[PDB]
């Protein structure tokens, strides 16, 4: 069966969202006009993910973003769900002619009748995308003349700099959530850049000519602890000061690696510049983003930083204008793409079957439902961990186990650990009443080419539901390697829910 | 609910069981015993078995058993079964859900039902994740009928450790890493002799502190020590084989012999048990075993034992900087002896490559999958579409992914330009495609991708066949599609490995 009916309802006054390119705001409010079997009019039920939508073809990384509207139909529409994306299949298991086009036939008397409830038109429903909840819907064109138009947002009347409007937009939708004001730190990023070309006179000790990566870099790490020195960027060298992806010497390869990619035919086309700075890599170092954390969530901070990278660019070119116009242009935006990746949800590392890194390691649960400790019944689960390493063979000591004194048990007889697919019993001791250590009884070693399934048997000896207060942890601790000695730490997060 | 693909009935069927030690003559007297799945238990696959064979109480040093055959008279049904839940199996099988699941398996009432006229019923399950074997779950009863042969008795074989049980396993491969380990360990011996009374050397042992020091000046001077020794024409192999490698450089010998002086006490240095315990879980063997990058390169027995004799040496001298030095010679190589088996056997057992199946590709801070395993078969012999994920991400800062070389066959294989983005963070990017040449297409997303800890992507490729010619061989130059990351001028590059399949 192809059709999702618990997705897929009537309704009156059906309304969507349209991202729209910029020249088009204005026209597309008078009404919607024009593979095949997918040729049709697109919306969302999301106006942020609608504003994706709205960047310039020509310029999609650092073009004008045009508008969002809000489409309606009047009277009842039916919202078909479908639980596959492929045509050919879903006319099979339909019964249309495999010849006709499918959005096509979408829109006949015929299909609106066998499949629309008695709506006056159909509208397609699929999953946006992969990691959201969104969802996508394809209008049949000549229905879709029935739409009434409105204006969401405007992003070009705004009258902002590069593509602020849109992105300050899409923070709306996280109410942790990064909520920047770029017009303050843009504005603050100028004043800090000539407020420092005003002992920041380390430009008469440079080079000023070709010299070496080795030595260019070199020079910019001294640039780098002078400038910080200056009060304007105070804050910044309070912040930076431990976390090593945050260290000059950072800074001044990223600087480097910028002035060898950027040619003159780039630096004068923010386009160019854009799609050359972000294939780079480092740019955590400006960004302040380790750890999957973004530390410089303010203003000033980030304005700081951006200060001190433009003018470490400017130092880097003569060794290997640029730097205070197009290249703040282009960083602008490469930090409004990561911010808006951070604020929209997603599954942090070792939740459901997002891999946990760490120490070499890479760790995950092998399916979502492994990641579910089911409850409210007796008997017997079983969970699935795949484990391996980048590259030399790293141990795996053992595992850290949750239990519940007489409702959740580790099953001592089916926990096993399985490396290439030879089956290794393990030892069970309790720590505790609430933690339970797993050795492996024979040494386990993963590594480029040698991966291993940790096996978790949990028992249930109470019908009962557990409570949250019961569970200390939510993590399953895998320990790797023995490194005041501690094991690396490898966790996969587990959530408690009823069976159904 | 039941696999009939993997169920059948047979005559004099057979299967191994791995015995402890102490119990290789008795069990052939006959299988007695000694909830829901309390029985006896067998696998079809005779070096699995020989992993059921250590001693109970040392696991990780002590002494193997054997395996024995065990056969049953006349007919046998296999039954396969799709899921491990004895309350699902129960249940599924419209059976008493009150007795248990293997006690009820050897009764007459469910050997009429579904025996299909063999005198039994044998449970068979997968028997383990990577694994093609599978176990075998006998009734306690019905077991009695079994006739047991010996295949193998490793203590007869009078090997030191448990080399006559790794030397079994290893013929499961006819690459196959299948070393001599009595020659390995006289060779080792050896070494350690004739590197002990060497000028250079003995010289390098008096210029020792001697006495305990900071951790740092231990290194400094094990990282001296490791280089005069590479020198002495009995390590002139090592001295090749390790010189460019940088996992294998005189820097990693010496953090390995601080780490093992470090966790070496003296209950522990005379104890072969507890000392492979301490052993088994220091970072860096990869070091001495010379393993890397996929590969066991350490191969030969001749080079095996100039790094054990080296490591041997260093772990000597690593003792007095930070309790006896003779810990070095004895359990120490007896030990890691034991740890080169564990991980030589690994490498020897069947297993997808990274980036193959679901096996992460583990790149420059990157990881990509297959989110499936049929994402990552391109099936073929039809006209029309498919679908295929692969799961990115990077371990902790942002890193790019400037895009993806996709495969093409002209006129029978493209890329499905509009059904082709990724999505990050469940934002959808959609890409630029354009052809390299008539193999191989490029695309790049239009707005910025990067990954890093908390952001993935999903890359979803999409082909179009336009023909329902099957793809040949002859037509597909790659077997990868290639993510590329970042810029350093060369893009970090990403494999993700297909396989070409007709229909099921």
Redesign the interface.
């Known amino acids: 069966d192809v059709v999702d009916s618990s997705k897929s309802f009537v309704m009156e006054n059906f309304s969507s969202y349209h991202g729209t390119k910029p020249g088009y705001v204005d026209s597309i409010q008078k009404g919607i006009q024009k ?1 095949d079997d ?1 040729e049709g009019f697109y919306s969302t039920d999301n106006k942020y ?1 609608a504003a ?1 939508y709205s ?1 310039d073809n020509e310029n ?2 650092s073009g004008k973003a045009g508008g969002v509207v809000k489409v309606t139909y009047p009277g009842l529409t039916k919202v078909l769900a479908l639980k596959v ?4 299949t879903i006319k099979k298991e339909l019964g249309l002619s495999l010849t006709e086009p499918l959005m096509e036939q979408v829109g006949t008397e015929e299909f609106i009748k066998r499949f629309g409830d008695g709506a006056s038109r159909v509208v397609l429903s699929l999953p ?7 969802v996508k819907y394809i209008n049949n064109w000549e229905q879709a003349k029935a739409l009434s138009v409105e204006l969401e947002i405007n992003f070009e009347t705004r009258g902002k700099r590069g593509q602020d409007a849109m992105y300050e937009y899409m923070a709306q939708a996280c109410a942790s959530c990064i909520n920047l004001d770029w017009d303050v730190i843009r504005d603050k990023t100028k004043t800090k850049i000539e407020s420092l070309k005003e002992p920041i006179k380390k430009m008469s000790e440079s080079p000023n000519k070709t010299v070496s990566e080795e030595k260019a870099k070199q020079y910019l790490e001294e640039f780098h602890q002078t400038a910080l020195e200056h009060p304007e960027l105070s804050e910044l060298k309070t912040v930076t000061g431990t976390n090593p ?1 945050f260290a000059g010497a950072n800074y001044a390869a990223w600087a480097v690696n910028v002035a060898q ?1 950027i040619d003159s035919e780039t630096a004068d086309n923010l386009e160019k510049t ?1 799609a050359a700075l ?8 400006v ?1 302040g ?5 973004v530390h410089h969530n303010t203003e000033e901070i980030v304005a700081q930083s951006i200060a001190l990278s433009s003018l470490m660019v400017a130092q880097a070119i003569p060794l290997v204008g640029f730097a205070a116009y197009n290249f703040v242009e282009s960083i602008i ?2 930090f409004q ?2 911010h ?3 604020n ?6 070792g939740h459901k ?3 946990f ?2 120490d070499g390691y ?1 760790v995950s649960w ?1 399916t979502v439902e492994d990641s579910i400790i089911r409850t409210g019944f007796q ?2 689960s ?1 969970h ?1 961990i795949k484990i ?8 795996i ?1 053992g595992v850290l186990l949750p239990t519940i004194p007489g409702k959740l048990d580790v099953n001592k ?2 926990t ?1 650990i ?6 290794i ?1 393990m ?1 069970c001791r309790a720590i505790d009443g609430d933690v339970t250590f797993c050795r492996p ?3 386990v ?1 993963v ?5 291993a ?1 940790l ?1 978790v048997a949990f028992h249930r000896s109470s019908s009962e539901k557990i409570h949250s207060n019961e569970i200390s942890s939510d993590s399953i601790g895998v320990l790797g ?3 005041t ?1 501690v ?1 690396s730490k490898l966790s996969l997060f587990f959530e408690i829910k009823s069976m159904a």
């Open positions: 593979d997918w993910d994706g960047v999609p990384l994306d492929n045509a050919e946006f995308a992969e990691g959201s909840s969104s992806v990619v854009t972000s294939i780079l890599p480092g740019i955590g170092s960004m983003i380790a750890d999957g954390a935006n490469l793409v990561v808006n990746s951070y929209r949800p997603a599954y942090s590392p079957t997002q891999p890194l760490h890479a092998n008997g017997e079983g699935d391996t390493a980048e590259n030399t063979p790293l141990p000591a007889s089916k096993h399985s490396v290439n697919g030879r089956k019993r030892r009884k024979s040494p070693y590594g480029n080419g040698v991966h399934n096996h390697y023995q490194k000695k094991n």
